[PDB]
Amino acid sequence: MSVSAFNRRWAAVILEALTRHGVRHICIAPGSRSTLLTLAAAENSAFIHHTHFDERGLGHLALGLAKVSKQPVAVIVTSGTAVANLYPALIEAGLTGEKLILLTADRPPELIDCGANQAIRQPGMFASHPTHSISLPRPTQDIPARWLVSTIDHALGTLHAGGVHINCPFAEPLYGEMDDTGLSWQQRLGDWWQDDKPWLREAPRLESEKQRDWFFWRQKRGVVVAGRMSAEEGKKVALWAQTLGWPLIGDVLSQTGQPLPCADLWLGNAKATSELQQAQIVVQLGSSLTGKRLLQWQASCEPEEYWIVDDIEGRLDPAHHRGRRLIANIADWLELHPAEKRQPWCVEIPRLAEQAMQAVIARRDAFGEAQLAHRICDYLPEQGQLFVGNSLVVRLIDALSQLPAGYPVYSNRGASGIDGLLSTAAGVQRASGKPTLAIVGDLSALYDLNALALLRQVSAPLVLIVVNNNGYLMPQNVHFEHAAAMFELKYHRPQNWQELETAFADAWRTPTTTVIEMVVNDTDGAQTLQQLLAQVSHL
Amino acid sequence: SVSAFNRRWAAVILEALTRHGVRHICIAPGSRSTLLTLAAAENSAFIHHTHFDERGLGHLALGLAKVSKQPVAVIVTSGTAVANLYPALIEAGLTGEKLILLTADRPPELIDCGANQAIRQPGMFASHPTHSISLPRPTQDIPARWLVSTIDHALGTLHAGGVHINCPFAEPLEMDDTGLSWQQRLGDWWQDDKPWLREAPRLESEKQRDWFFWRQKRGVVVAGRMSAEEGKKVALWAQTLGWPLIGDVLSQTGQPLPCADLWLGNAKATSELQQAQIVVQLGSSLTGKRLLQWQASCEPEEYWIVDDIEGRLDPAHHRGRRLIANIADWLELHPAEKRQPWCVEIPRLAEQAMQAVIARRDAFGEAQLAHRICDYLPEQGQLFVGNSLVVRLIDALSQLPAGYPVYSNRGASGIDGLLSTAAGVQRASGKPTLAIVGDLSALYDLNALALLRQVSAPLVLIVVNNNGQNVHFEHAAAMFELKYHRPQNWQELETAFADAWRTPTTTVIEMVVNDTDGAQTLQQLLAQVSHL
Ligand SMILES: O=C(O)CCC(=O)C(=O)O
Ligand SMILES: O=C(O)CCC(=O)C(=O)O
Ligand SMILES: [Cl-]
Ligand SMILES: [Cl-]
Ligand SMILES: [Mg+2]
Ligand SMILES: [Mg+2]
Ligand code: NA
Ligand code: NA
Ligand code: NA
Ligand code: NA
Ligand code: NA
Ligand code: NA
Ligand code: NA
Ligand code: NA
Ligand code: NA
Ligand code: NA
Ligand code: NA
Ligand code: NA
Ligand code: NA
Ligand code: NA
Ligand code: NA
Ligand code: NA
Ligand code: NA
Numbered sequence A: 001m002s003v004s005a006f007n008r009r010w011a012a013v014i015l016e017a018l019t020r021h022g023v024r025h026i027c028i029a030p031g032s033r034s035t036l037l038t039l040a041a042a043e044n045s046a047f048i049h050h051t052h053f054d055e056r057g058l059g060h061l062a063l064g065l066a067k068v069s070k071q072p073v074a075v076i077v078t079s080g081t082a083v084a085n086l087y088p089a090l091i092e093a094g095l096t097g098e099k100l101i102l103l104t105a106d107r108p109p110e111l112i113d114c115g116a117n118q119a120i121r122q123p124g125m126f127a128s129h130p131t132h133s134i135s136l137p138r139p140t141q142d143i144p145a146r147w148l149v150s151t152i153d154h155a156l157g158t159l160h161a162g163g164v165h166i167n168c169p170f171a172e173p174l175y176g177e178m179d180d181t182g183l184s185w186q187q188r189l190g191d192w193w194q195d196d197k198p199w200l201r202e203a204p205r206l207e208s209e210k211q212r213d214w215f216f217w218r219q220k221r222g223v224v225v226a227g228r229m230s231a232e233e234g235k236k237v238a239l240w241a242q243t244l245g246w247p248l249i250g251d252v253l254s255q256t257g258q259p260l261p262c263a264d265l266w267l268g269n270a271k272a273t274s275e276l277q278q279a280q281i282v283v284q285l286g287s288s289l290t291g292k293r294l295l296q297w298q299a300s301c302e303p304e305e306y307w308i309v310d311d312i313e314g315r316l317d318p319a320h321h322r323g324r325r326l327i328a329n330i331a332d333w334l335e336l337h338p339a340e341k342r343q344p345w346c347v348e349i350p351r352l353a354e355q356a357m358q359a360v361i362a363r364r365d366a367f368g369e370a371q372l373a374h375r376i377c378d379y380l381p382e383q384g385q386l387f388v389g390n391s392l393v394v395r396l397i398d399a400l401s402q403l404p405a406g407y408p409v410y411s412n413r414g415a416s417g418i419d420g421l422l423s424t425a426a427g428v429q430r431a432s433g434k435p436t437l438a439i440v441g442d443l444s445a446l447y448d449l450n451a452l453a454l455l456r457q458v459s460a461p462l463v464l465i466v467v468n469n470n471g472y473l474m475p476q477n478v479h480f481e482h483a484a485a486m487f488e489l490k491y492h493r494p495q496n497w498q499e500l501e502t503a504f505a506d507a508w509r510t511p512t513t514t515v516i517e518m519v520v521n522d523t524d525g526a527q528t529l530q531q532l533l534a535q536v537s538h539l
Numbered sequence B: 001s002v003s004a005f006n007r008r009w010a011a012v013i014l015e016a017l018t019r020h021g022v023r024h025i026c027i028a029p030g031s032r033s034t035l036l037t038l039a040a041a042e043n044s045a046f047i048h049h050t051h052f053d054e055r056g057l058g059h060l061a062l063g064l065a066k067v068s069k070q071p072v073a074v075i076v077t078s079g080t081a082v083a084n085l086y087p088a089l090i091e092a093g094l095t096g097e098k099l100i101l102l103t104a105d106r107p108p109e110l111i112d113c114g115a116n117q118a119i120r121q122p123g124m125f126a127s128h129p130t131h132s133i134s135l136p137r138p139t140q141d142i143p144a145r146w147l148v149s150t151i152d153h154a155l156g157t158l159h160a161g162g163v164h165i166n167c168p169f170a171e172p173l174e175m176d177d178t179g180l181s182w183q184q185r186l187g188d189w190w191q192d193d194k195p196w197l198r199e200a201p202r203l204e205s206e207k208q209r210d211w212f213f214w215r216q217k218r219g220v221v222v223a224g225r226m227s228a229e230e231g232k233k234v235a236l237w238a239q240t241l242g243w244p245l246i247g248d249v250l251s252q253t254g255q256p257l258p259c260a261d262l263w264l265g266n267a268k269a270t271s272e273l274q275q276a277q278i279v280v281q282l283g284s285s286l287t288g289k290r291l292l293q294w295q296a297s298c299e300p301e302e303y304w305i306v307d308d309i310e311g312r313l314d315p316a317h318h319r320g321r322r323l324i325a326n327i328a329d330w331l332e333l334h335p336a337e338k339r340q341p342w343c344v345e346i347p348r349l350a351e352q353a354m355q356a357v358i359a360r361r362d363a364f365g366e367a368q369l370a371h372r373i374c375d376y377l378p379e380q381g382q383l384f385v386g387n388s389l390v391v392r393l394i395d396a397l398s399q400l401p402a403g404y405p406v407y408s409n410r411g412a413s414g415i416d417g418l419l420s421t422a423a424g425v426q427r428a429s430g431k432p433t434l435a436i437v438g439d440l441s442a443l444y445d446l447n448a449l450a451l452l453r454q455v456s457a458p459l460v461l462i463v464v465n466n467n468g469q470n471v472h473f474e475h476a477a478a479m480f481e482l483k484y485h486r487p488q489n490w491q492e493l494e495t496a497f498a499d500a501w502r503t504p505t506t507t508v509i510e511m512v513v514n515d516t517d518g519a520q521t522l523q524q525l526l527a528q529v530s531h532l
């Protein structure tokens, strides 16, 4: 008899199944036609719950949680444009491999395309961006609970990386009658209910094989380029390159400690370019390289072979070198392709690197963007993590700073959207519980302004540094003092290093967010970068 | 010079669009869109609007299109910028605004190889735009007449909804003469005022040959969203036929049988309606709970929906007719003939309904604000309503004047872009504007207070706060240098307004209420009115 009693049990089966695939965190924007999913989510003790009222920011919240935990993270939303607001964070996940399980409630098929409310076409809404899309059928008991959990297990089990869109229509009414309808339908799953594992286990691994000619290649003149990877991988890559005797170019996202710092500067030197032309093979581990000089060099170098090792699939070399694209966990890969001690073949590079760091240091003082970027590793929280936006300021950290090996760095450098940086940082901080430094420009802060609601609720101190270069009535110069106030966050606008170091100490005390607004020019940082680059090009 | 030719290809795209009434252009600053952007700046045909949030940029453009009834272009750079446009594109696809999305793209060699800010853009919006064009990589080997014809075809044939034109450009982005002669192949089209190719079919239903029979039956007229002029014409027409007119808040009909959401819960009213043999619905997106239940359950011999949107609009799937037409043209094609009012109990029920509500107009609550709203309407202005309890309340408790413009985002009723849509609504027409929103809506689109800063006539944003949080908007107002008031009674409210109408600025009025009085008061009026 009861359609709502049945709808609840369909929904509970879908949630129970996610539970068998590592889904722990779940993000929900409340709204009264996803009711069944939200409701099955609350009954389910397995989930840690997060909410936000802006579905765009909710996607990014989920994206941040996945990015740090390396587990799949679910998102439930109600039917209509709620769903479309998930696209950005979905897109970013498809590039960087976050597993976002989007459960989008939908009207039933009889209510689509007929003037009904909050009703749009949701199946295939995200085109090729999900790794898998499941458009679930209208709930009925005539489809066995084993089909339903098997379809979900198929999608999650085969999922190497990226998001999955599960569209979930529900018959109206979403409320009412409250009986045993669909009770024996659930009971056919038997003791899968007290189990632990998927109903259907489908989990093939996608992995490249051991390169049998590694023992030759490892004795040639190689270079290691280290892109985005985990904190732990960065230290491993640092050891492996050092053992090989190969120059390591490490990105801000690599956490290698950057043994050859200020690459963005020293790749400008003709002495450095000439040593590198002698390179017979380049082994690039990780991807999304940050620096202009590194991107130019990569694009123009001509080693016999060019290798990209990364756990994401597809082509990762925008200059299309002849070589290899190797799919792997970077740490397993280094295991499979171990180093033997060999004397370094580079003689000039390690000098130029030192000299470049000395040049930046002769410049540490003017209270600006480039200098904050240079000194950033002085303000990093102890046992913390850094989240870094899509701004000049982070190319400047990459160019002018030397971050410590193994210190966690996170970002959104898939498509480098500037639309979700605060909600992302909020997910990054929640997943790990660590105190967090997030560095962002003013447009990114204005873009995701309402994620300040999210940042109120951090589990450790979070410092949001907003680098502000600004950025009918005369245009105004916006600031973030009232924004902070509006959300009961701490706020500082330091004028000098003493005030910044002070602002940082007060910030690192309680668990909430302190906004530190650093007003700067729209030219000093760029300008300082160029000066150091010419200086180094000459050295 | 690749660069010099890329500017000229972009040039041709933009000039094409001007021959189709595109006057407004909304732009979000971005490095990879520079060519469409520069081209746009150099073309005098356009009025330019900027926003930093692409989602709110889409909704601005939607607000512009909603009032202007002309196509509005949007330009964004490659990447998730593009995806931020989906919400407004989807809305347009339902209410019929013509948003022309020009999405800059990396050239095809740079897709799917880990390049920066590079994503799969063609087909990205799935079935939602009315037409989608994935333009080829620019080259002078494809002649300019192809490019303009492709555009003239997308826009000439556009009945309603959006158009996605993906525009890849090769890099670098050396002011040569490189594609000059390529452009000059268009000869004097460049000095012309029309499209290159004119393809402009009309989509429209034929005259209903049996109207003279049906216009004498016992009909009910239901009026949803339509233009202000049409609101007045439908009122005249319904009156002439002797048929009751259930006029939505979006109808601008003057609601001659006000408080339908109450009197529809009375058996004397429904029983009289049961005698209805035809329902003519003009427009759609009906607002009221009672009206939506009534609509779903009614059982005339035929149900008609007249609207210029295409596709089914009756979610009860009644037997009858779906008629595509400009409402105004349709009335002319199907004239009323003067005829005696077949209804007796309803006009009295409506009156006692209003009377019942006037009786409880004093408490300083959501419901009373809603009932008294026409005391605060700006003269010769326009109202913009959110998707919020407070606007159900206006529809239930108020009677808005015939022919006063009302606008809304009520296709998919997202709460995601109401401020930025409001800002486009004010700019399209230049009128002073009232916009009514809930706290959650205002939070959702908070950064669009930056658009509301820049208005050509006063705008008042009533934010109706029943906060579940416990946030306020004084600091948001202060962040963007907007005037702010939190009135605590009717005198403080009336005063906030007098101030508000003097200068071309936005003032934020925050009404703080309860999460229950509003629902309660409506529930008690329903019961009361159902007992008459
Ligand atoms: O990249 C930059 O120059 C800073 C841009 C920025 O202004 C922002 O994202 O707020
Ligand atoms: O504030 C209202 O009028 C009710 C709707 C609502 O809660 C909101 O959109 O914030
Ligand atoms: Cl993940
Ligand atoms: Cl081509
Ligand atoms: Mg900036
Ligand atoms: Mg509210
Ligand atoms: Na789990
Ligand atoms: Na929605
Ligand atoms: Na699939
Ligand atoms: Na489906
Ligand atoms: Na079963
Ligand atoms: Na599985
Ligand atoms: Na039962
Ligand atoms: Na292999
Ligand atoms: Na091999
Ligand atoms: Na690092
Ligand atoms: Na590090
Ligand atoms: Na040299
Ligand atoms: Na590759
Ligand atoms: Na391979
Ligand atoms: Na850099
Ligand atoms: Na940023
Ligand atoms: Na925002």
Ligand code: NA
Pocket: A054, A056, A057, A447, A448, A449, A450, A451
């Ligand atoms: Na946002």
Ligand code: NA
Pocket: B027, B028, B029, B030, B033, B054, B075, B076, B077, B081
């Ligand atoms: Na843009």
Ligand code: NA
Pocket: B066, B095, B096, B097
């Ligand atoms: Na409309």
Ligand code: NA
Pocket: B065, B066, B068, B069, B070, B071, B072, B096, B097, B098, B099
């Ligand atoms: Na339009």
Ligand code: NA
Pocket: B121, B122, B123, B124, B125, B126, B129, B132, B164
């Ligand atoms: Na598309």
Ligand code: NA
Pocket: B136, B137
């Ligand atoms: Na092509």
Ligand code: NA
Pocket: B137, B138, B139
């Ligand atoms: Na070509």
Ligand code: NA
Pocket: B141
């Ligand atoms: Na050719």
Ligand code: NA
Pocket: B145, B149, B196, B197
């Ligand atoms: Na033609």
Ligand code: NA
Pocket: B135, B136, B137, B138, B166, B167, B168, B169
């Ligand atoms: Na193109």
Ligand code: NA
Pocket: B015, B016, B017, B019, B020, B148, B152, B194, B195, B196, B197
């Ligand atoms: Na044209």
Ligand code: NA
Pocket: none
């Ligand atoms: Na033709």
Ligand code: NA
Pocket: B245, B246, B247, B248, B255, B256, B257, B258, B259, B260
């Ligand atoms: Na009415």
Ligand code: NA
Pocket: B245, B246, B247, B248, B254, B255, B256, B257, B258, B260
């Ligand atoms: Na009426």
Ligand code: NA
Pocket: B261, B287, B288, B289, B290, B392, B396
């Ligand atoms: Na209602």
Ligand code: NA
Pocket: B288, B289, B290, B292, B293
């Ligand atoms: Na209803």
